[PDB]
Design a protein around this ligand. Structure first.
Ligand code: HEM
Ligand code: A1A0N
Ligand code: H4B
Ligand code: ZN
Length: 415
């Protein structure tokens, strides 16, 4: 009831008791492990008033135990106060401090996130007074500007009104605030990002005039209080982009690649004390491999391993020449170099995985554990020359938490 995790590169052993406070379920059983299912039936997100107070009580107990005032009068009065409001309203409203705490701890508990060493330096923007899609756009624009900070990126989250009935949900229909468009071609192939081909057509369905090229920043589709979503263009001066060059290969600029500085996930759901925030865009900075390995080299993404290998002049006939591996390393040397020469914050997969082990140590010391998803923590190249490959990790689900949720267009009762 006090599990141990070993690092087989350093013989370091850590004792996890934090998993005892775990509540949600993982998808695994005594006779099956689903640790490589991407969106397990559990990791996806309707509440009643009866279920709400245990969740509220549980959360308020964490928060007051945090500010070193656990079970005191201000706690018991806040317990009764929320209890009473869940009678009156069959819901309740978080204090600003309770919001900041929950948001920071949703990140802290995100077991697939290798960047959590920074979990306590998160900037929380309360957009719970928003009422309209235009309001959302304005709030989202201030988020991009603040988080980008002229290349010196800063962690931030903007929290729109919580779900109430279910049919009055605030949703950002984009999967990220800033993503490039993808257009299928009249011959089958794909221009821009193949990930977004459906979403790009939904934007054109709602009136977007597409410049139909490579790296066309998509407009924002914003749904407010359950109403139909509306298109908004982020002022280009707010979209900071890095053109990708190599520090040895002068032909690498002629590849004409670029990526945006700001990674900002907008399709997830923030859960705090049983309350559900359907729109909560959050942003940090990139680990290089997200761009150079996954975005640029996934077969169903930009898929440039073909063209980079050519210009390098590689033995592309045999699978075992490792021409793919070889072009993969250069591509990530270029992403890192380009972002660094422009003073745009980025982290290499070696530095970020070392910081995660450091972070893991702090969480096992001053918290008793650190939920972690090995399948997701290990970077998508050079696995075992990073220290997380050699580190056992217990995965378990704690609240507050970020959760996946269905796309709005598979569930929105239109008009
Ligand atoms: C500070 C810099 C950050 C870095 C370097 C970072 C890095 C990463 C990476 C590489 C992934 C894997 C995504 C993929 O490969 O597809 C990830 C996932 C994730 N990150 Fe972080 N991130 C950062 C900030 C944040 C912030 C500010 C939040 C929330 C407030 C957050 C919450 C998450 C969540 C929820 C996931 C998905 C995990 C899941 O599905 O359970 N991250 N992060
Ligand atoms: C705040 C943040 C920072 C970072 N460095 N990354 C992420 C991220 C999360 C997800 Cl769930 C997916 C992706 C990118 N994939 C589409 C490749 C990035 C989020
Ligand atoms: C099948 C598998 O679960 C899936 O491809 C996962 C593997 N690990 C990952 N790890 C990260 N960081 N990001 C991902 O998208 C994935 N995809
Ligand atoms: Zn398992």
């Amino acid at each position: 009831r006090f599990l141990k995790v070993k690092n087989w590169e350093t013989d370091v052993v850590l004792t996890d008791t934090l998993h005892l406070k775990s509540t949600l379920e993982t998808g695994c059983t005594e006779h099956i492990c689903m640790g490589s299912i991407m969106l397990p039936s559990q990791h996806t997100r309707v509440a009643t008033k009866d279920q709400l107070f245990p969740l509220a009580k549980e959360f308020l107990d964490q928060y007051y135990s945090s500010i070193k005032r656990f079970g005191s009068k201000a706690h018991m009065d806040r317990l009764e106060e929320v209890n009473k409001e869940i009678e009156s309203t069959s819901t309740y409203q978080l204090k600003d401090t309770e919001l900041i705490y929950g948001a920071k701890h949703a990140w802290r508990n995100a077991s697939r996130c290798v960047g959590r060493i920074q979990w306590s330096k998160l900037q929380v923007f309360d957009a719970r007074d928003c009422t309209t899609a235009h309001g959302m756009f304005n709030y989202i624009c201030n988020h991009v500007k603040y988080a980008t900070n002229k290349g010196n990126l800063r962690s931030a989250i903007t929290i729109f009104p919580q779900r109430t009935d279910g049919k009055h949900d605030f949703r950002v229909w984009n999967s990220q605030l800033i993503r490039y468009a993808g257009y299928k071609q009249p011959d089958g192939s794909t221009l821009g990002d193949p990930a977004n081909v459906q979403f790009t057509e939904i934007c054109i369905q709602q009136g977007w005039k597409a410049p139909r090229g490579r790296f066309d920043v998509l407009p924002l589709l914003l749904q407010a209080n359950g109403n139909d979503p509306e298109l908004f263009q982020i002022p280009p001066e707010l979209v900071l982009e890095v053109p990708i060059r190599h520090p040895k290969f002068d032909w690498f600029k002629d590849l004409g690649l670029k990526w945006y500085g700001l990674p900002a996930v907008s399709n997830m759901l923030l859960e705090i004390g049983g309350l559900e925030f359907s729109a909560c865009p959050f942003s940090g900075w990139y680990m290089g491999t997200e761009i150079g390995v996954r975005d640029y080299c996934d077969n169903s993404r930009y898929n440039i391993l073909e063209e980079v290998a050519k210009k390098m002049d590689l033995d592309m006939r045999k699978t075992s020449s490792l021409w793919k591996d070889q072009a993969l390393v250069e591509i990530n040397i270029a992403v890192l170099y380009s972002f660094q020469s422009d003073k745009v914050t980025i982290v290499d997969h070696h530095s970020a995985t070392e910081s995660f082990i450091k972070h893991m140590e702090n969480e096992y010391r001053c918290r008793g554990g650190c939920p972690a998803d090995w399948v997701w923590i290990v970077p998508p190249m050079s696995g075992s020359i990073t220290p997380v490959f050699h580190q056992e990790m217990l995965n378990y689900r704690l609240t507050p938490s970020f959760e996946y949720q269905p796309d709005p267009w598979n569930t929105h009762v239109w008009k």
